[PDB]
Amino acid sequence: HPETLVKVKDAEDQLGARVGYIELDLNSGKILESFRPEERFPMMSTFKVLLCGAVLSRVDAGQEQLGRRIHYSQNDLVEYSPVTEKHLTDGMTVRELCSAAITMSDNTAANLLLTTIGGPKELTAFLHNMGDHVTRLDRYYNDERDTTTPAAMATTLRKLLTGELLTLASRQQLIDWMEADKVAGPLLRSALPAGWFIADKSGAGERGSRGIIAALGPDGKPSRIVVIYTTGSQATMDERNRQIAEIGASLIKHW
């Protein structure tokens, strides 16, 4: 709705930064509104959902199993490893490692999973082969690296969640893990009335990078995909969260 576009612009003005916005009908796949849909923004942690799609894909093909156990060491742990740092002796299963990467945004978990698929290059290869030639991951835990565009991301996410790529079990698993997200409380979730469904993944990078990707909708059921990125701002974390939240209040109001 245009008022939502207003809020995205307001947000650009108030942040002194670029803001990219996509609202997507989950059913038809068609764009309800957009703003800078073809500009590149850092994915930050939002890439972890695409990483687990890749993962689930291998599991559908039987090149991976969700119950397979990975052991690792202190060596492997990078900054912000809330779940992984607790399982150095018993290891983690692939599932768990997805759970950690999506629900808690565990960095070491993302890395381990990237190793299981053959690295950033293979994730990019996976996104390439599903029709997203735009998004690229280049690294483990105006630079084009590790970027997407709001359109590329919104569409790739819609293919992963409701498209022909994944089995039904795997689409339900991916959505489940997103639904269990514990580290995006102040973003879209803050705007959500009682009984709405939301399944998301947030991100936060230096320079002012903040973002979220989400499937949501009224009465327990997702009906749209929303993607919001912003980078360039010198604003605090909290003022970014607020601006994503306000954008979120608007799109709920005008649903």
mmCIF file of C-alpha atoms in Angstrom:
data_model
loop_
_atom_site.group_PDB
_atom_site.id
_atom_site.type_symbol
_atom_site.label_atom_id
_atom_site.label_comp_id
_atom_site.label_asym_id
_atom_site.label_seq_id
_atom_site.Cartn_x
_atom_site.Cartn_y
_atom_site.Cartn_z
ATOM 1 C CA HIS A 1 0.000 0.000 0.000
ATOM 2 C CA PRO A 2 1.416 3.474 -0.825
ATOM 3 C CA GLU A 3 1.417 4.545 2.874
ATOM 4 C CA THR A 4 3.876 1.707 3.487
ATOM 5 C CA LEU A 5 6.055 3.138 0.711
ATOM 6 C CA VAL A 6 5.762 6.443 2.525
ATOM 7 C CA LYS A 7 7.216 4.790 5.661
ATOM 8 C CA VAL A 8 10.062 3.271 3.796
ATOM 9 C CA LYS A 9 10.927 6.705 2.382
ATOM 10 C CA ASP A 10 10.451 8.327 5.836
ATOM 11 C CA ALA A 11 12.828 5.665 7.067
ATOM 12 C CA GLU A 12 15.382 6.498 4.391
ATOM 13 C CA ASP A 13 15.184 10.139 5.400
ATOM 14 C CA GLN A 14 15.370 9.500 9.115
ATOM 15 C CA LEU A 15 18.248 7.021 8.821
ATOM 16 C CA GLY A 16 20.146 8.963 6.117
ATOM 17 C CA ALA A 17 20.390 5.617 4.342
ATOM 18 C CA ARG A 18 19.185 3.298 1.600
ATOM 19 C CA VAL A 19 16.233 1.026 2.325
ATOM 20 C CA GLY A 20 15.090 -1.811 0.111
ATOM 21 C CA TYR A 21 11.597 -3.205 0.374
ATOM 22 C CA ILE A 22 9.606 -6.042 -1.235
ATOM 23 C CA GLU A 23 6.124 -7.183 -0.449
ATOM 24 C CA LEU A 24 5.238 -10.414 -2.282
ATOM 25 C CA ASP A 25 2.049 -12.458 -2.551
ATOM 26 C CA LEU A 26 3.131 -15.934 -1.432
ATOM 27 C CA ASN A 27 0.427 -17.654 -3.483
ATOM 28 C CA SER A 28 0.765 -15.970 -6.934
ATOM 29 C CA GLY A 29 4.383 -14.930 -6.432
ATOM 30 C CA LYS A 30 3.564 -11.433 -7.587
ATOM 31 C CA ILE A 31 4.964 -8.228 -6.254
ATOM 32 C CA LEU A 32 2.472 -6.117 -4.282
ATOM 33 C CA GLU A 33 4.915 -3.332 -3.775
ATOM 34 C CA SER A 34 8.566 -2.648 -4.025
ATOM 35 C CA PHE A 35 11.249 -0.125 -3.302
ATOM 36 C CA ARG A 36 14.811 -0.365 -4.695
ATOM 37 C CA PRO A 37 14.047 -3.958 -5.705
ATOM 38 C CA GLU A 38 17.156 -4.172 -7.862
ATOM 39 C CA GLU A 39 19.672 -2.581 -5.521
ATOM 40 C CA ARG A 40 22.250 -4.711 -3.707
ATOM 41 C CA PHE A 41 22.303 -4.833 0.071
ATOM 42 C CA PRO A 42 24.356 -6.954 2.444
ATOM 43 C CA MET A 43 22.482 -10.131 3.286
ATOM 44 C CA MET A 44 24.142 -10.404 6.668
ATOM 45 C CA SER A 45 22.628 -13.355 8.578
ATOM 46 C CA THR A 46 19.540 -13.580 6.340
ATOM 47 C CA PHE A 47 21.650 -15.838 4.131
ATOM 48 C CA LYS A 48 21.389 -18.607 6.757
ATOM 49 C CA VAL A 49 17.867 -19.477 5.512
ATOM 50 C CA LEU A 50 19.207 -19.973 2.002
ATOM 51 C CA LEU A 51 22.037 -22.028 3.442
ATOM 52 C CA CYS A 52 19.543 -24.394 5.084
ATOM 53 C CA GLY A 53 17.500 -24.582 1.889
ATOM 54 C CA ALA A 54 20.706 -25.859 0.233
ATOM 55 C CA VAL A 55 21.086 -28.173 3.103
ATOM 56 C CA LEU A 56 17.520 -29.512 2.973
ATOM 57 C CA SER A 57 18.021 -29.909 -0.775
ATOM 58 C CA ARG A 58 20.944 -32.275 -0.211
ATOM 59 C CA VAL A 59 18.789 -34.093 2.300
ATOM 60 C CA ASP A 60 15.965 -34.467 -0.223
ATOM 61 C CA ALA A 61 18.522 -35.931 -2.675
ATOM 62 C CA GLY A 62 19.940 -38.163 0.065
ATOM 63 C CA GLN A 63 23.420 -36.639 -0.114
ATOM 64 C CA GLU A 64 22.751 -35.433 3.484
ATOM 65 C CA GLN A 65 20.766 -36.611 6.529
ATOM 66 C CA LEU A 66 19.294 -34.310 9.226
ATOM 67 C CA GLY A 67 20.362 -36.689 11.962
ATOM 68 C CA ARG A 68 23.992 -36.829 10.817
ATOM 69 C CA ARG A 69 26.350 -35.694 13.601
ATOM 70 C CA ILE A 70 29.172 -33.233 13.238
ATOM 71 C CA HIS A 71 31.871 -32.988 15.863
ATOM 72 C CA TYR A 72 34.098 -29.910 15.937
ATOM 73 C CA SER A 73 36.446 -27.942 18.254
ATOM 74 C CA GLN A 74 37.243 -24.592 19.900
ATOM 75 C CA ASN A 75 39.333 -24.165 16.784
ATOM 76 C CA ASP A 76 36.131 -23.981 14.750
ATOM 77 C CA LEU A 77 34.224 -21.549 17.055
ATOM 78 C CA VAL A 78 33.939 -17.955 15.840
ATOM 79 C CA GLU A 79 32.411 -14.935 17.516
ATOM 80 C CA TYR A 80 28.751 -15.315 18.523
ATOM 81 C CA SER A 81 28.386 -19.058 18.881
ATOM 82 C CA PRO A 82 25.629 -19.359 21.504
ATOM 83 C CA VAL A 83 24.507 -22.903 20.683
ATOM 84 C CA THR A 84 27.614 -24.414 19.123
ATOM 85 C CA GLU A 85 29.972 -23.455 21.974
ATOM 86 C CA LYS A 86 27.835 -25.697 24.232
ATOM 87 C CA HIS A 87 28.325 -28.945 22.223
ATOM 88 C CA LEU A 88 32.085 -29.361 21.759
ATOM 89 C CA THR A 89 32.067 -32.860 23.300
ATOM 90 C CA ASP A 90 28.768 -34.332 22.017
ATOM 91 C CA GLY A 91 28.728 -32.536 18.617
ATOM 92 C CA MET A 92 25.562 -31.412 16.817
ATOM 93 C CA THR A 93 23.263 -32.862 14.180
ATOM 94 C CA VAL A 94 22.681 -31.151 10.883
ATOM 95 C CA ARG A 95 19.127 -30.331 11.988
ATOM 96 C CA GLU A 96 20.325 -28.801 15.238
ATOM 97 C CA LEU A 97 22.959 -26.863 13.322
ATOM 98 C CA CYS A 98 20.197 -25.414 11.095
ATOM 99 C CA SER A 99 18.135 -24.744 14.144
ATOM 100 C CA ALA A 100 21.012 -22.804 15.627
ATOM 101 C CA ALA A 101 21.766 -20.913 12.395
ATOM 102 C CA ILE A 102 18.175 -19.831 11.809
ATOM 103 C CA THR A 103 16.626 -19.557 15.348
ATOM 104 C CA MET A 104 19.672 -18.083 17.116
ATOM 105 C CA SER A 105 21.778 -16.936 14.167
ATOM 106 C CA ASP A 106 24.724 -19.003 15.360
ATOM 107 C CA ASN A 107 27.777 -18.125 13.328
ATOM 108 C CA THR A 108 29.839 -21.240 13.852
ATOM 109 C CA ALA A 109 26.743 -23.224 12.918
ATOM 110 C CA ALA A 110 26.515 -21.426 9.562
ATOM 111 C CA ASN A 111 30.187 -22.186 8.921
ATOM 112 C CA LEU A 112 29.849 -25.864 9.669
ATOM 113 C CA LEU A 113 26.851 -26.104 7.409
ATOM 114 C CA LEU A 114 28.716 -24.243 4.662
ATOM 115 C CA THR A 115 31.474 -26.871 4.941
ATOM 116 C CA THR A 116 28.887 -29.664 4.543
ATOM 117 C CA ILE A 117 27.802 -28.298 1.127
ATOM 118 C CA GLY A 118 31.271 -27.307 -0.143
ATOM 119 C CA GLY A 119 31.387 -23.633 0.855
ATOM 120 C CA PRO A 120 29.996 -20.234 -0.230
ATOM 121 C CA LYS A 121 30.729 -21.048 -3.849
ATOM 122 C CA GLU A 122 28.472 -24.098 -3.757
ATOM 123 C CA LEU A 123 25.665 -22.103 -2.088
ATOM 124 C CA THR A 124 25.956 -19.519 -4.841
ATOM 125 C CA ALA A 125 25.956 -22.473 -7.301
ATOM 126 C CA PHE A 126 22.757 -23.732 -5.694
ATOM 127 C CA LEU A 127 21.063 -20.288 -5.899
ATOM 128 C CA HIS A 128 22.255 -19.918 -9.485
ATOM 129 C CA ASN A 129 20.634 -23.229 -10.428
ATOM 130 C CA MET A 130 17.325 -22.293 -8.898
ATOM 131 C CA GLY A 131 17.117 -19.150 -11.044
ATOM 132 C CA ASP A 132 18.696 -16.528 -8.778
ATOM 133 C CA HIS A 133 21.736 -15.251 -10.655
ATOM 134 C CA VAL A 134 21.924 -12.147 -8.411
ATOM 135 C CA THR A 135 22.436 -13.272 -4.893
ATOM 136 C CA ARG A 136 25.998 -14.339 -4.031
ATOM 137 C CA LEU A 137 27.692 -15.627 -0.871
ATOM 138 C CA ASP A 138 31.456 -15.273 -0.820
ATOM 139 C CA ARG A 139 32.621 -15.517 2.703
ATOM 140 C CA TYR A 140 32.385 -17.644 5.839
ATOM 141 C CA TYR A 141 32.348 -16.165 9.342
ATOM 142 C CA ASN A 142 29.633 -0.929 -2.295
ATOM 143 C CA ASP A 143 31.195 -4.403 -2.038
ATOM 144 C CA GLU A 144 28.980 -6.774 -4.020
ATOM 145 C CA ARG A 145 30.091 -9.784 -2.010
ATOM 146 C CA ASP A 146 27.620 -11.448 0.353
ATOM 147 C CA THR A 147 24.800 -9.337 -1.143
ATOM 148 C CA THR A 148 21.302 -9.877 -2.610
ATOM 149 C CA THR A 149 18.606 -7.563 -3.970
ATOM 150 C CA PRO A 150 15.244 -7.376 -2.321
ATOM 151 C CA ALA A 151 13.553 -8.932 -5.371
ATOM 152 C CA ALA A 152 16.043 -11.739 -5.794
ATOM 153 C CA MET A 153 15.765 -12.620 -2.089
ATOM 154 C CA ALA A 154 11.993 -12.337 -1.928
ATOM 155 C CA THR A 155 11.554 -14.596 -4.967
ATOM 156 C CA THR A 156 14.251 -17.177 -3.931
ATOM 157 C CA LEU A 157 12.692 -17.331 -0.508
ATOM 158 C CA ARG A 158 9.232 -17.938 -2.091
ATOM 159 C CA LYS A 159 10.635 -20.776 -4.212
ATOM 160 C CA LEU A 160 12.196 -22.326 -1.126
ATOM 161 C CA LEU A 161 9.065 -22.087 0.986
ATOM 162 C CA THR A 162 6.285 -22.834 -1.503
ATOM 163 C CA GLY A 163 7.940 -23.744 -4.802
ATOM 164 C CA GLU A 164 8.834 -26.983 -6.577
ATOM 165 C CA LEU A 165 12.421 -27.132 -5.343
ATOM 166 C CA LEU A 166 11.973 -28.834 -1.954
ATOM 167 C CA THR A 167 9.942 -31.736 -0.710
ATOM 168 C CA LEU A 168 6.961 -30.997 1.437
ATOM 169 C CA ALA A 169 8.815 -32.187 4.585
ATOM 170 C CA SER A 170 11.729 -29.937 3.780
ATOM 171 C CA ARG A 171 9.549 -26.844 3.117
ATOM 172 C CA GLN A 172 7.784 -27.460 6.415
ATOM 173 C CA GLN A 173 11.110 -27.875 8.226
ATOM 174 C CA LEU A 174 12.533 -24.675 6.779
ATOM 175 C CA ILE A 175 9.408 -22.679 7.638
ATOM 176 C CA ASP A 176 9.354 -24.248 11.118
ATOM 177 C CA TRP A 177 12.911 -23.143 11.928
ATOM 178 C CA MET A 178 12.143 -19.653 10.736
ATOM 179 C CA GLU A 179 8.960 -19.643 12.819
ATOM 180 C CA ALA A 180 11.077 -20.456 15.838
ATOM 181 C CA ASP A 181 13.356 -17.408 15.284
ATOM 182 C CA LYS A 182 14.426 -16.035 18.711
ATOM 183 C CA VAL A 183 16.531 -13.047 17.682
ATOM 184 C CA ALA A 184 14.177 -10.798 15.775
ATOM 185 C CA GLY A 185 11.819 -9.834 18.611
ATOM 186 C CA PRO A 186 11.954 -6.040 18.006
ATOM 187 C CA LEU A 187 11.465 -6.182 14.231
ATOM 188 C CA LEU A 188 8.326 -7.263 12.354
ATOM 189 C CA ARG A 189 7.177 -9.447 15.270
ATOM 190 C CA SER A 190 6.692 -6.299 17.383
ATOM 191 C CA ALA A 191 4.026 -5.078 14.917
ATOM 192 C CA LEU A 192 2.143 -8.347 14.660
ATOM 193 C CA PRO A 193 -1.376 -8.605 16.124
ATOM 194 C CA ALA A 194 -2.416 -11.663 18.172
ATOM 195 C CA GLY A 195 -2.826 -14.874 16.079
ATOM 196 C CA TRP A 196 -0.755 -13.862 13.067
ATOM 197 C CA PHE A 197 1.746 -16.318 11.617
ATOM 198 C CA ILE A 198 5.326 -15.150 11.143
ATOM 199 C CA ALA A 199 8.455 -17.010 10.219
ATOM 200 C CA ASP A 200 11.521 -14.882 9.653
ATOM 201 C CA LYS A 201 15.217 -14.305 9.734
ATOM 202 C CA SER A 202 16.929 -11.051 10.685
ATOM 203 C CA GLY A 203 20.375 -9.697 9.961
ATOM 204 C CA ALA A 204 22.650 -6.932 11.262
ATOM 205 C CA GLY A 205 25.886 -5.656 9.740
ATOM 206 C CA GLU A 206 28.249 -2.753 10.368
ATOM 207 C CA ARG A 207 27.907 0.570 8.549
ATOM 208 C CA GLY A 208 24.245 0.468 9.512
ATOM 209 C CA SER A 209 23.260 -2.816 7.962
ATOM 210 C CA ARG A 210 19.980 -4.248 9.274
ATOM 211 C CA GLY A 211 17.453 -6.517 7.581
ATOM 212 C CA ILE A 212 14.789 -9.100 7.724
ATOM 213 C CA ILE A 213 13.074 -11.616 5.410
ATOM 214 C CA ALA A 214 9.713 -13.084 6.390
ATOM 215 C CA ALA A 215 6.659 -15.016 5.524
ATOM 216 C CA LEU A 216 3.634 -13.886 7.474
ATOM 217 C CA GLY A 217 -0.102 -13.448 7.420
ATOM 218 C CA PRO A 218 -3.315 -13.343 9.496
ATOM 219 C CA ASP A 219 -4.909 -16.149 11.524
ATOM 220 C CA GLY A 220 -2.062 -18.619 11.881
ATOM 221 C CA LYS A 221 -1.280 -18.770 8.162
ATOM 222 C CA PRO A 222 1.368 -17.081 5.977
ATOM 223 C CA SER A 223 0.151 -15.227 2.890
ATOM 224 C CA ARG A 224 2.958 -12.806 1.944
ATOM 225 C CA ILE A 225 6.693 -12.484 1.880
ATOM 226 C CA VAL A 226 8.323 -9.274 3.061
ATOM 227 C CA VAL A 227 11.953 -8.413 2.670
ATOM 228 C CA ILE A 228 13.520 -5.274 4.222
ATOM 229 C CA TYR A 229 17.193 -4.251 4.023
ATOM 230 C CA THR A 230 18.939 -1.081 4.987
ATOM 231 C CA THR A 231 22.604 -0.167 4.943
ATOM 232 C CA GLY A 232 24.647 3.098 5.141
ATOM 233 C CA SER A 233 23.176 4.501 8.342
ATOM 234 C CA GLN A 234 25.140 5.692 11.372
ATOM 235 C CA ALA A 235 22.038 5.018 13.445
ATOM 236 C CA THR A 236 21.995 2.794 16.514
ATOM 237 C CA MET A 237 20.724 -0.776 16.365
ATOM 238 C CA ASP A 238 17.620 0.247 18.257
ATOM 239 C CA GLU A 239 16.718 3.018 15.791
ATOM 240 C CA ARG A 240 17.074 0.643 12.909
ATOM 241 C CA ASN A 241 14.816 -1.922 14.644
ATOM 242 C CA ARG A 242 12.191 0.741 15.213
ATOM 243 C CA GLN A 243 12.196 1.733 11.559
ATOM 244 C CA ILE A 244 11.705 -1.901 10.371
ATOM 245 C CA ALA A 245 8.973 -2.168 13.006
ATOM 246 C CA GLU A 246 7.224 0.971 11.790
ATOM 247 C CA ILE A 247 7.395 -0.229 8.198
ATOM 248 C CA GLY A 248 5.874 -3.415 9.647
ATOM 249 C CA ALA A 249 3.090 -1.625 11.480
ATOM 250 C CA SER A 250 2.180 0.098 8.177
ATOM 251 C CA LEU A 251 1.977 -3.049 6.092
ATOM 252 C CA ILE A 252 -0.164 -4.704 8.804
ATOM 253 C CA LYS A 253 -2.465 -1.661 9.019
ATOM 254 C CA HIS A 254 -2.936 -1.667 5.231
ATOM 255 C CA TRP A 255 -3.125 -5.469 4.796
#
